[PDB]
Amino acid sequence: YDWNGAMQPLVSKMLQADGVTAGSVLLVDSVNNRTNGSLNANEATETLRNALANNGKFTLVSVQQLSMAKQQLGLSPQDSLGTRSKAIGIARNVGAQYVLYSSASGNVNAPALQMQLMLVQTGEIIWSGKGAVQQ
Structure with a gap:
C-alpha cells in the first residue's frame, strides 16, 4: 500500500480549506479498517x-x-473513539481544536481512503x- 500517495494529496487539500488553521492542536483518530480483509x-x-x-505543523x-x-472519562483502555461524542469528549479534555476521522473501505487490495x-x-x-x- 502506498499510503503517502493517498494521504499526501488529501492532507494538502485539507490544509487549503477555509477554517483549518495550521499549527493548531489536532486529534488524529486511528484509521478504521472497513475492508473485506x-x-x-x-x-x-x-x-x-x-x-x-x-x-501544516499541527501539534x-x-x-x-x-x-x-x-481513563479519566471511564472509557475502556482500548476504546477506538469510534463515535463522535466520545471523540469530542476526549478532544475537550486534551485541548484539541480539531478531530480527524479516517477509514479505509471496499476491497482489501484496492481500498478507498476517506477522511x-x-x-x-x-x-x-x-x-x-x-x-x-x-500499491
Missing part, C-alpha cells in the same frame, strides 16, 4: 500522523495523552476528502 491499522495511522506533523495529541484521557475534519467547538464537519489507495 485485515489491514495494519497503526501503520496507516503513523503515516497519517507524519503527513500531518510535517505539512498532535500523543498516544499517551489519549490513553490518559480515556473528515471535525471542529471540536461546535461538532461540525468543516472538511471532507476521499482518495483511492494504490
